C-alpha cells in the first residue's frame, strides 16, 4: 500500500484485511507491530553544540571585542613579540571574557532544551481506534497504532497517522494542514479516490496526514503509514525553519547596544585626542608615532573595558533560565518571547469550560414535564448520584430510588442523549477509571443514559468494559442514525436524523436536537408530556426557563442543556446540507422534552491565582460560550466578582456587546470581567478590542472556539488536556493544567526584566568610573594610573562572571505587588541615569584618589605635594620646585596598583549593590545569589593571583601590596556600598535591617577596616 488515495476504500480495506465496523484483531496488531514498529519518529535534538557556540558570537557588542583582540594581536606582533603568550596577554584576556560568557550562554541553552524535551513525555499522545477486543471505540496510545486499524477522529483532534478516509460521520470534514502543506485555510476532505498516482499533498483530498488537526467534523479511516513512513515523517530532515524574530526586549537592548557603541566610539576618540599634547614624551623615545600607537591602545583598551560584552550573553541566559524554570512547573514554552512578554501582561482573558473549570462534568439534575395546565405547567425534577464518568449512579425523584422505565418522558430523554452523541465512555484498565472519548458535555450524557436504564437491561455479568456503553447500545440498536447535523456555534445546537429499525412505520423518522436551552426552546412549538405532545405557550416557556436560570445561578452552578425532538422532519433529499446556515432552518417546529444540568467544578488553584493576578494589577476576563447566569456564578465562585457585587455593566453577552455604541464598547472592555454567549469570532473581537487600548492580553483556552482568540493575543496559553487545535495556536502549554503556573510565568517574565536592569546598572555605573578615572587624571595633570593591559584586566574580572551572575538574581519581595510595565516606555529612566553617574563619579574619583594618596599621604611612598604631582612632567634635577624628589618615582608601579586594586574592589562591592534595584543589602543579603558571591570570590582570587604569584606582577606592571595599603583599598572601596544604600533609600521613601546575621558579619569588618 503505497498510493492509497488512488484506490477504492474497499480495496484499501481488503489490503489490510480489516472491517470498518469492528476493527483490527489483537493478534493482527501483534503481527503488524512486529513488522512496522512503533508509531513514532526518532528523537531530534535542536542544535549542535558547535552551532550553539557560533550563536554566541553574533551580536555587535561581541564582534567589537573580536576586532579589538585582532588589533591587540597585530600591534603586539609589530612590536618586539619575540616571546610566548606573556607578550600576548592583551589579546588573551579579551578572549577569556568572550569564551567565558559563551560557555554560560551555551550551558544555559542546553539545560533549557533538555528540560523542554523531558516535558514532551509528560503525557503520551493518545488515539481513538476500533479493535476487536471491545465493541466500542477505545483510547490507545498513538505510538501503538499499526498500519491497518480503524482510527476515529473528531473536531479538534490531531491526526495520529497517515489515514485513508473511509467514512465522514458529519456533513463536512475540514482539516488544518498548514504544518505540512503551507496553506492557511481549512481543507475540505472527501472519501472518493483521486486518479493521479503522482498527486501532490494538496490534491490528496481523501487522505489525512499525521501532525495535522481536524478543524471541523468527525470521520474515520484506515491507517496506511506510521512512524517515519508518514508524509510529515519523510520530510523531518527537510525542516528549514522560519526566522523567529528576537524578543521585543532584545529589540530594546540591541537599540541600546547600538546607541552605547556610538558613545563609546566618541569617548575613545576623545581619549586619543586629549593626549595629543604628550605624544613626544621621553617615555616614548620622542617619537610621535610610538606615542600615538601607545595612546591608540589606551583607546582600544578603554573601548573593551567600557563596552558591555556580556550583555548579549546575559540576555539569552535569563531567557533560557525562564524557559527551564517554567518546564519544572510543567509549562511547555514554545515561543521564546512569550515568557518575558507575560511579565508585561495586563489582561488575562480565559476560557471558562475546561480552562477555569476541571472538565469533569456529570449530569446531576434533569426535569421533564409532568402535567401542563392552562398557560402553566408542573415539572418532574430528578437528581442523579455520581460526579465521575463511571456508570454507577442512581436517579432520585424525591430522595427516593426510582426506575426511569416508568416515565415515558425519561425514556425519550435518554434516547436523545444516546443518539445525539458524538462521544462515548471508555474504561482505562491501567488506571482503573472510566475516561471520556470526545467532549465532556456529550460524555456526561453518555454516562447519564447508563445510570437510568430506561430499557431495563440486566447488568450482572457485564464486565467493567462492557458496562461503559451497555445501555447506550440497546438504544442505538432501536433507531438507525441516518445523518448528523454537526454542532455549530452560530446555532448552538446539534441534530441527528434517526429511523427505527423495526419496520412498523411507527414514527417513521425523527430528529433529536440538543443544544443551548434558550436557543432550542425558542425553536420549540410544542411540548412533550409523557407520550402526548401539547402546543407550547408563553407561560410554560417562562417556567421552564426559570428552573434553568435557577440551576445556573444556584449553589453548584449547573451547566444546562435542552433536549428536543422533531416529529415531522423533511427527507434527506429535501434538506440541502451544503452549508451550516441552513441547519437552523431544519431545527424548527420542535417539541420540548427536557433539560439536563451537569456540574463542572472550578479548579482548586484558580481562586488563588485570580487573587494574585489582581494583586499584580492584572485583570482576568472570562470569555465563554456558556450561559450568562452560569458564567456569573462561576465568576463569583472563583473570585472575579463578589458574592454580592453588582455585575450589571461588568457582565455582557455576545449580542448585548454587539448592540452597543462605540461609547459603551469603549467602557466595556476596561470594566467588563465576564463575556458570555460569545462565538469563536466574538472572542477575537474582544481580544482585539483590549489590544486597541495598548494592553498586553494573555488569552487562555482549551477548545477550538478559542483558537481564533489564541492567535490574536500577545500570549496564547493552552491547557494540556485541551484539543490539539488550541495547542497549535498557542505559545505556551500548561502540560499539567495548573492555572497557578500562569501566575508563575508572570513573575518569571518580571524577574527576567529585573535581572537585565540590574545588569545594566552594574556595568554602566562601573564602567563610567573607568572612563572618569582616565579623564579626571588627564584634567588634574597626574600620571596616568592605568596602562592598556591593566584596563583589560579590570574588564576581565569585573565585566565577566560577576556581571553574568546578575541573571541568577532572586526575585524581589514586591515583584508581584507592582502594576504591569508599559513595554513602550524608555529602557533607562532619568532617575536611573542619575544613579549611574553618581556611582560612576565615585568609582572614578576613588581610583584617582587612591593613586594620589600614595604620592601625597602614604608613608611608604614619597611626600610630594599637589603641585609637584600635577606638574610631574617638568620634574628635573635643575628644578628648584622639585627638591629631594626623584623623577623616577613618578613611574612607580605602586600608585598604578593602588588604582587597579581600588577599581577591582570597588566594582565587586558595586556588584553587591545589584542584587535588587531598591532593596537594601540588609534586607536582601548577598548570599541570596550564591552565584554572585562565588563569582566575586573568584575575581578577587584572580586579582590576588596576579599580585603575589612569582612572575605575574612584572607582566601587568604592578606591585604586591601590604596590609596597610590593602586596608586603604578597602577604606576607599567600601563607601560605594553606603552610597548605593542611600540612593536605594531615596528611591523607596521618596520615589515609590531584617537580616541581623548579615549585620553581625560586616560590622566587625567595618570596625576593623576603619579602625
Ligand atoms: N455537542 C454539543 N451539542 C449541542 N450543544 C452543545 C454542544 N456543546 C456545547 N453545546 C452548547 O453550545 C453552547 C455554546 O457553544 P460553546 O462551544 O461556545 O460553549 P462551551 O462549552 O465551549 C463554553 P467555553 O467557551 O468557555 O469553553 C454551550 O453553552 C452548550 O450549551
Ligand atoms: Ca567591557
Ligand atoms: Ca567593569
Ligand atoms: Mg473551553
mmCIF file of N, CA and C in Angstrom, residues 830-936:
data_model
loop_
_atom_site.group_PDB
_atom_site.id
_atom_site.type_symbol
_atom_site.label_atom_id
_atom_site.label_comp_id
_atom_site.label_asym_id
_atom_site.label_seq_id
_atom_site.Cartn_x
_atom_site.Cartn_y
_atom_site.Cartn_z
ATOM 1 N N UNK A 830 15.225 58.483 33.776
ATOM 2 C CA UNK A 830 16.071 59.610 34.127
ATOM 3 C C UNK A 830 16.646 59.479 35.523
ATOM 4 N N UNK A 831 15.875 58.898 36.443
ATOM 5 C CA UNK A 831 16.380 58.660 37.790
ATOM 6 C C UNK A 831 17.483 57.611 37.785
ATOM 7 N N UNK A 832 17.399 56.641 36.873
ATOM 8 C CA UNK A 832 18.434 55.618 36.793
ATOM 9 C C UNK A 832 19.719 56.179 36.202
ATOM 10 N N UNK A 833 19.611 57.089 35.231
ATOM 11 C CA UNK A 833 20.810 57.715 34.682
ATOM 12 C C UNK A 833 21.545 58.521 35.743
ATOM 13 N N UNK A 834 20.817 59.039 36.732
ATOM 14 C CA UNK A 834 21.469 59.734 37.835
ATOM 15 C C UNK A 834 22.210 58.756 38.736
ATOM 16 N N UNK A 835 21.633 57.575 38.962
ATOM 17 C CA UNK A 835 22.290 56.574 39.797
ATOM 18 C C UNK A 835 23.543 56.033 39.122
ATOM 19 N N UNK A 836 23.548 55.996 37.789
ATOM 20 C CA UNK A 836 24.717 55.502 37.070
ATOM 21 C C UNK A 836 25.862 56.501 37.152
ATOM 22 N N UNK A 837 25.552 57.790 37.008
ATOM 23 C CA UNK A 837 26.588 58.813 37.079
ATOM 24 C C UNK A 837 27.063 59.021 38.510
ATOM 25 N N UNK A 838 26.149 58.940 39.477
ATOM 26 C CA UNK A 838 26.525 59.141 40.872
ATOM 27 C C UNK A 838 27.510 58.075 41.334
ATOM 28 N N UNK A 839 27.268 56.820 40.959
ATOM 29 C CA UNK A 839 28.195 55.751 41.313
ATOM 30 C C UNK A 839 29.448 55.827 40.451
ATOM 31 N N UNK A 840 29.287 56.138 39.164
ATOM 32 C CA UNK A 840 30.441 56.240 38.288
ATOM 33 C C UNK A 840 31.359 57.390 38.653
ATOM 34 N N UNK A 841 30.793 58.475 39.184
ATOM 35 C CA UNK A 841 31.620 59.602 39.599
ATOM 36 C C UNK A 841 32.428 59.262 40.842
ATOM 37 N N UNK A 842 31.904 58.379 41.694
ATOM 38 C CA UNK A 842 32.663 57.967 42.869
ATOM 39 C C UNK A 842 33.714 56.925 42.510
ATOM 40 N N UNK A 843 33.384 56.006 41.601
ATOM 41 C CA UNK A 843 34.341 54.975 41.209
ATOM 42 C C UNK A 843 35.566 55.606 40.562
ATOM 43 N N UNK A 844 35.362 56.657 39.768
ATOM 44 C CA UNK A 844 36.491 57.327 39.146
ATOM 45 C C UNK A 844 37.289 58.167 40.123
ATOM 46 N N UNK A 845 36.600 58.904 40.997
ATOM 47 C CA UNK A 845 37.294 59.737 41.973
ATOM 48 C C UNK A 845 38.034 58.888 42.998
ATOM 49 N N UNK A 846 37.464 57.740 43.366
ATOM 50 C CA UNK A 846 38.136 56.850 44.305
ATOM 51 C C UNK A 846 39.393 56.249 43.693
ATOM 52 N N UNK A 847 39.381 56.025 42.378
ATOM 53 C CA UNK A 847 40.527 55.407 41.723
ATOM 54 C C UNK A 847 41.648 56.417 41.511
ATOM 55 N N UNK A 848 41.295 57.671 41.234
ATOM 56 C CA UNK A 848 42.304 58.718 41.133
ATOM 57 C C UNK A 848 42.802 59.114 42.517
ATOM 58 N N UNK A 849 41.918 59.090 43.516
ATOM 59 C CA UNK A 849 42.332 59.420 44.866
ATOM 60 C C UNK A 849 43.243 58.382 45.484
ATOM 61 N N UNK A 850 43.121 57.125 45.054
ATOM 62 C CA UNK A 850 43.989 56.078 45.580
ATOM 63 C C UNK A 850 45.430 56.282 45.134
ATOM 64 N N UNK A 851 45.631 56.644 43.867
ATOM 65 C CA UNK A 851 46.975 56.929 43.382
ATOM 66 C C UNK A 851 47.497 58.256 43.913
ATOM 67 N N UNK A 852 46.609 59.221 44.153
ATOM 68 C CA UNK A 852 47.035 60.483 44.747
ATOM 69 C C UNK A 852 47.351 60.311 46.226
ATOM 70 N N UNK A 853 46.695 59.353 46.884
ATOM 71 C CA UNK A 853 47.006 59.074 48.281
ATOM 72 C C UNK A 853 48.431 58.561 48.435
ATOM 73 N N UNK A 854 48.862 57.670 47.541
ATOM 74 C CA UNK A 854 50.196 57.094 47.665
ATOM 75 C C UNK A 854 51.276 58.141 47.428
ATOM 76 N N UNK A 855 51.060 59.036 46.466
ATOM 77 C CA UNK A 855 52.065 60.048 46.169
ATOM 78 C C UNK A 855 52.163 61.091 47.272
ATOM 79 N N UNK A 856 51.049 61.408 47.926
ATOM 80 C CA UNK A 856 50.955 62.559 48.820
ATOM 81 C C UNK A 856 50.911 62.133 50.286
ATOM 82 N N UNK A 857 50.060 61.163 50.621
ATOM 83 C CA UNK A 857 49.769 60.867 52.018
ATOM 84 C C UNK A 857 50.381 59.569 52.527
ATOM 85 N N UNK A 858 50.643 58.595 51.661
ATOM 86 C CA UNK A 858 51.121 57.302 52.128
ATOM 87 C C UNK A 858 52.511 57.418 52.742
ATOM 88 N N UNK A 859 52.796 56.524 53.690
ATOM 89 C CA UNK A 859 54.067 56.560 54.403
ATOM 90 C C UNK A 859 55.182 55.910 53.593
ATOM 91 N N UNK A 860 54.906 54.752 52.993
ATOM 92 C CA UNK A 860 55.933 54.066 52.226
ATOM 93 C C UNK A 860 56.367 54.842 50.999
ATOM 94 N N UNK A 861 55.446 55.590 50.398
ATOM 95 C CA UNK A 861 55.748 56.371 49.224
ATOM 96 C C UNK A 861 56.344 57.719 49.569
ATOM 97 N N UNK A 862 56.586 58.543 48.554
ATOM 98 C CA UNK A 862 57.111 59.886 48.806
ATOM 99 C C UNK A 862 56.047 60.785 49.412
ATOM 100 N N UNK A 863 56.455 62.011 49.715
ATOM 101 C CA UNK A 863 55.579 63.014 50.307
ATOM 102 C C UNK A 863 55.464 64.244 49.414
ATOM 103 N N UNK A 864 55.313 64.029 48.106
ATOM 104 C CA UNK A 864 55.195 65.151 47.187
ATOM 105 C C UNK A 864 53.893 65.896 47.458
ATOM 106 N N UNK A 865 53.854 67.160 47.049
ATOM 107 C CA UNK A 865 52.669 67.977 47.248
ATOM 108 C C UNK A 865 51.724 67.829 46.059
ATOM 109 N N UNK A 866 50.620 68.575 46.094
ATOM 110 C CA UNK A 866 49.689 68.552 44.973
ATOM 111 C C UNK A 866 50.281 69.249 43.756
ATOM 112 N N UNK A 867 51.105 70.276 43.977
ATOM 113 C CA UNK A 867 51.728 70.973 42.857
ATOM 114 C C UNK A 867 52.765 70.096 42.169
ATOM 115 N N UNK A 868 53.597 69.407 42.949
ATOM 116 C CA UNK A 868 54.622 68.548 42.372
ATOM 117 C C UNK A 868 54.036 67.316 41.700
ATOM 118 N N UNK A 869 52.784 66.976 41.996
ATOM 119 C CA UNK A 869 52.122 65.858 41.340
ATOM 120 C C UNK A 869 51.371 66.281 40.087
ATOM 121 N N UNK A 870 50.817 67.493 40.069
ATOM 122 C CA UNK A 870 50.121 67.988 38.891
ATOM 123 C C UNK A 870 51.067 68.523 37.826
ATOM 124 N N UNK A 871 52.342 68.713 38.151
ATOM 125 C CA UNK A 871 53.349 69.187 37.208
ATOM 126 C C UNK A 871 54.538 68.240 37.185
ATOM 127 N N UNK A 872 54.270 66.936 37.278
ATOM 128 C CA UNK A 872 55.341 65.953 37.372
ATOM 129 C C UNK A 872 56.172 65.857 36.100
ATOM 130 N N UNK A 873 55.646 66.319 34.966
ATOM 131 C CA UNK A 873 56.366 66.222 33.703
ATOM 132 C C UNK A 873 57.547 67.176 33.614
ATOM 133 N N UNK A 874 57.537 68.269 34.375
ATOM 134 C CA UNK A 874 58.640 69.216 34.394
ATOM 135 C C UNK A 874 59.595 68.977 35.555
ATOM 136 N N UNK A 875 59.561 67.790 36.155
ATOM 137 C CA UNK A 875 60.472 67.469 37.244
ATOM 138 C C UNK A 875 61.866 67.178 36.704
ATOM 139 N N UNK A 876 62.836 67.994 37.110
ATOM 140 C CA UNK A 876 64.223 67.798 36.715
ATOM 141 C C UNK A 876 65.119 68.092 37.908
ATOM 142 N N UNK A 877 66.389 67.706 37.778
ATOM 143 C CA UNK A 877 67.352 67.962 38.844
ATOM 144 C C UNK A 877 67.624 69.453 38.984
ATOM 145 N N UNK A 878 67.524 70.191 37.883
ATOM 146 C CA UNK A 878 67.754 71.628 37.870
ATOM 147 C C UNK A 878 66.516 72.434 38.249
ATOM 148 N N UNK A 879 65.455 71.781 38.721
ATOM 149 C CA UNK A 879 64.222 72.474 39.063
ATOM 150 C C UNK A 879 64.203 72.771 40.552
ATOM 151 N N UNK A 880 64.115 74.038 40.963
ATOM 152 C CA UNK A 880 64.067 74.329 42.405
ATOM 153 C C UNK A 880 62.748 73.944 43.050
ATOM 154 N N UNK A 881 61.666 73.877 42.274
ATOM 155 C CA UNK A 881 60.383 73.475 42.840
ATOM 156 C C UNK A 881 60.393 72.003 43.233
ATOM 157 N N UNK A 882 61.164 71.187 42.521
ATOM 158 C CA UNK A 882 61.273 69.758 42.799
ATOM 159 C C UNK A 882 62.620 69.511 43.470
ATOM 160 N N UNK A 883 62.626 69.511 44.801
ATOM 161 C CA UNK A 883 63.835 69.300 45.586
ATOM 162 C C UNK A 883 63.675 68.044 46.425
ATOM 163 N N UNK A 884 64.675 67.168 46.372
ATOM 164 C CA UNK A 884 64.623 65.921 47.102
ATOM 165 C C UNK A 884 63.667 64.899 46.539
ATOM 166 N N UNK A 885 63.045 65.179 45.398
ATOM 167 C CA UNK A 885 62.082 64.284 44.772
ATOM 168 C C UNK A 885 62.742 63.671 43.548
ATOM 169 N N UNK A 886 62.609 62.357 43.404
ATOM 170 C CA UNK A 886 63.126 61.681 42.227
ATOM 171 C C UNK A 886 62.093 61.709 41.107
ATOM 172 N N UNK A 887 62.574 61.903 39.879
ATOM 173 C CA UNK A 887 61.671 61.857 38.735
ATOM 174 C C UNK A 887 61.292 60.426 38.390
ATOM 175 N N UNK A 888 62.039 59.449 38.909
ATOM 176 C CA UNK A 888 61.729 58.052 38.632
ATOM 177 C C UNK A 888 60.571 57.560 39.488
ATOM 178 N N UNK A 889 60.267 58.269 40.575
ATOM 179 C CA UNK A 889 59.217 57.849 41.497
ATOM 180 C C UNK A 889 57.855 58.044 40.847
ATOM 181 N N UNK A 890 57.797 58.872 39.807
ATOM 182 C CA UNK A 890 56.551 59.095 39.092
ATOM 183 C C UNK A 890 56.215 57.969 38.123
ATOM 184 N N UNK A 891 57.171 57.088 37.826
ATOM 185 C CA UNK A 891 56.912 55.857 37.095
ATOM 186 C C UNK A 891 56.824 54.651 38.021
ATOM 187 N N UNK A 892 56.471 54.868 39.283
ATOM 188 C CA UNK A 892 56.417 53.777 40.240
ATOM 189 C C UNK A 892 55.201 52.895 39.968
ATOM 190 N N UNK A 893 55.327 51.578 40.143
ATOM 191 C CA UNK A 893 54.165 50.695 39.988
ATOM 192 C C UNK A 893 53.265 50.643 41.211
ATOM 193 N N UNK A 894 53.617 51.336 42.293
ATOM 194 C CA UNK A 894 52.758 51.356 43.476
ATOM 195 C C UNK A 894 51.459 52.122 43.252
ATOM 196 N N UNK A 895 51.460 53.360 42.741
ATOM 197 C CA UNK A 895 50.174 54.042 42.534
ATOM 198 C C UNK A 895 49.323 53.405 41.453
ATOM 199 N N UNK A 896 49.935 52.733 40.478
ATOM 200 C CA UNK A 896 49.154 52.027 39.469
ATOM 201 C C UNK A 896 48.473 50.804 40.066
ATOM 202 N N UNK A 897 49.114 50.169 41.049
ATOM 203 C CA UNK A 897 48.486 49.050 41.739
ATOM 204 C C UNK A 897 47.389 49.531 42.677
ATOM 205 N N UNK A 898 47.569 50.710 43.276
ATOM 206 C CA UNK A 898 46.537 51.271 44.140
ATOM 207 C C UNK A 898 45.281 51.599 43.346
ATOM 208 N N UNK A 899 45.451 52.078 42.112
ATOM 209 C CA UNK A 899 44.300 52.363 41.265
ATOM 210 C C UNK A 899 43.668 51.080 40.741
ATOM 211 N N UNK A 900 44.493 50.093 40.387
ATOM 212 C CA UNK A 900 43.964 48.835 39.867
ATOM 213 C C UNK A 900 43.281 48.024 40.961
ATOM 214 N N UNK A 901 43.801 48.088 42.188
ATOM 215 C CA UNK A 901 43.185 47.346 43.282
ATOM 216 C C UNK A 901 41.880 47.992 43.723
ATOM 217 N N UNK A 902 41.851 49.322 43.808
ATOM 218 C CA UNK A 902 40.618 50.019 44.158
ATOM 219 C C UNK A 902 39.557 49.795 43.088
ATOM 220 N N UNK A 903 39.961 49.798 41.817
ATOM 221 C CA UNK A 903 39.000 49.651 40.728
ATOM 222 C C UNK A 903 38.348 48.274 40.746
ATOM 223 N N UNK A 904 39.131 47.232 41.028
ATOM 224 C CA UNK A 904 38.581 45.879 41.072
ATOM 225 C C UNK A 904 37.734 45.689 42.324
ATOM 226 N N UNK A 905 38.200 46.223 43.454
ATOM 227 C CA UNK A 905 37.491 46.036 44.715
ATOM 228 C C UNK A 905 36.216 46.870 44.770
ATOM 229 N N UNK A 906 36.243 48.080 44.209
ATOM 230 C CA UNK A 906 35.067 48.941 44.258
ATOM 231 C C UNK A 906 33.989 48.444 43.305
ATOM 232 N N UNK A 907 34.360 47.622 42.322
ATOM 233 C CA UNK A 907 33.373 47.079 41.398
ATOM 234 C C UNK A 907 32.806 45.755 41.888
ATOM 235 N N UNK A 908 33.551 45.028 42.721
ATOM 236 C CA UNK A 908 32.976 43.870 43.393
ATOM 237 C C UNK A 908 31.951 44.303 44.430
ATOM 238 N N UNK A 909 32.201 45.431 45.099
ATOM 239 C CA UNK A 909 31.210 45.984 46.013
ATOM 240 C C UNK A 909 30.027 46.563 45.250
ATOM 241 N N UNK A 910 30.274 47.092 44.051
ATOM 242 C CA UNK A 910 29.188 47.615 43.231
ATOM 243 C C UNK A 910 28.296 46.499 42.708
ATOM 244 N N UNK A 911 28.850 45.300 42.521
ATOM 245 C CA UNK A 911 28.035 44.164 42.104
ATOM 246 C C UNK A 911 27.143 43.682 43.241
ATOM 247 N N UNK A 912 27.595 43.842 44.487
ATOM 248 C CA UNK A 912 26.747 43.518 45.628
ATOM 249 C C UNK A 912 25.584 44.490 45.747
ATOM 250 N N UNK A 913 25.749 45.713 45.246
ATOM 251 C CA UNK A 913 24.663 46.681 45.203
ATOM 252 C C UNK A 913 23.656 46.390 44.106
ATOM 253 N N UNK A 914 23.769 45.251 43.421
ATOM 254 C CA UNK A 914 22.952 44.966 42.248
ATOM 255 C C UNK A 914 22.099 43.715 42.416
ATOM 256 N N UNK A 915 21.943 43.213 43.643
ATOM 257 C CA UNK A 915 21.010 42.113 43.859
ATOM 258 C C UNK A 915 19.565 42.566 43.746
ATOM 259 N N UNK A 916 19.312 43.864 43.870
ATOM 260 C CA UNK A 916 17.969 44.412 43.788
ATOM 261 C C UNK A 916 18.088 45.876 43.402
ATOM 262 N N UNK A 917 17.014 46.410 42.826
ATOM 263 C CA UNK A 917 17.046 47.805 42.409
ATOM 264 C C UNK A 917 16.924 48.748 43.597
ATOM 265 N N UNK A 918 15.980 48.484 44.501
ATOM 266 C CA UNK A 918 15.717 49.376 45.616
ATOM 267 C C UNK A 918 15.820 48.717 46.983
ATOM 268 N N UNK A 919 15.957 47.397 47.055
ATOM 269 C CA UNK A 919 16.034 46.723 48.343
ATOM 270 C C UNK A 919 17.451 46.805 48.891
ATOM 271 N N UNK A 920 17.562 47.167 50.166
ATOM 272 C CA UNK A 920 18.855 47.360 50.796
ATOM 273 C C UNK A 920 19.609 46.036 50.895
ATOM 274 N N UNK A 921 20.912 46.139 51.162
ATOM 275 C CA UNK A 921 21.710 44.938 51.386
ATOM 276 C C UNK A 921 21.364 44.280 52.713
ATOM 277 N N UNK A 922 20.734 45.020 53.626
ATOM 278 C CA UNK A 922 20.329 44.443 54.902
ATOM 279 C C UNK A 922 19.095 43.565 54.740
ATOM 280 N N UNK A 923 18.195 43.935 53.830
ATOM 281 C CA UNK A 923 17.004 43.123 53.602
ATOM 282 C C UNK A 923 17.312 41.931 52.705
ATOM 283 N N UNK A 924 18.053 42.158 51.620
ATOM 284 C CA UNK A 924 18.448 41.092 50.703
ATOM 285 C C UNK A 924 19.954 40.890 50.781
ATOM 286 N N UNK A 925 20.442 39.990 51.629
ATOM 287 C CA UNK A 925 21.889 39.822 51.795
ATOM 288 C C UNK A 925 22.518 39.228 50.548
ATOM 289 N N UNK A 926 23.843 39.327 50.409
ATOM 290 C CA UNK A 926 24.484 38.820 49.185
ATOM 291 C C UNK A 926 24.348 37.321 48.990
ATOM 292 N N UNK A 927 24.142 36.552 50.061
ATOM 293 C CA UNK A 927 24.038 35.105 49.902
ATOM 294 C C UNK A 927 22.713 34.674 49.287
ATOM 295 N N UNK A 928 21.816 35.615 48.983
ATOM 296 C CA UNK A 928 20.620 35.274 48.223
ATOM 297 C C UNK A 928 20.981 34.831 46.812
ATOM 298 N N UNK A 929 22.079 35.356 46.275
ATOM 299 C CA UNK A 929 22.638 34.932 44.996
ATOM 300 C C UNK A 929 24.003 34.317 45.287
ATOM 301 N N UNK A 930 24.060 32.985 45.326
ATOM 302 C CA UNK A 930 25.317 32.310 45.637
ATOM 303 C C UNK A 930 26.216 32.264 44.408
ATOM 304 N N UNK A 931 25.645 32.497 43.225
ATOM 305 C CA UNK A 931 26.453 32.577 42.015
ATOM 306 C C UNK A 931 27.254 33.871 41.978
ATOM 307 N N UNK A 932 26.682 34.952 42.510
ATOM 308 C CA UNK A 932 27.389 36.226 42.533
ATOM 309 C C UNK A 932 28.487 36.227 43.586
ATOM 310 N N UNK A 933 28.207 35.662 44.761
ATOM 311 C CA UNK A 933 29.228 35.561 45.799
ATOM 312 C C UNK A 933 30.402 34.728 45.307
ATOM 313 N N UNK A 934 30.120 33.592 44.672
ATOM 314 C CA UNK A 934 31.192 32.760 44.154
ATOM 315 C C UNK A 934 31.973 33.432 43.041
ATOM 316 N N UNK A 935 31.296 34.247 42.229
ATOM 317 C CA UNK A 935 31.981 34.947 41.146
ATOM 318 C C UNK A 935 32.841 36.085 41.678
ATOM 319 N N UNK A 936 32.414 36.718 42.771
ATOM 320 C CA UNK A 936 33.211 37.782 43.371
ATOM 321 C C UNK A 936 34.446 37.206 44.049
#
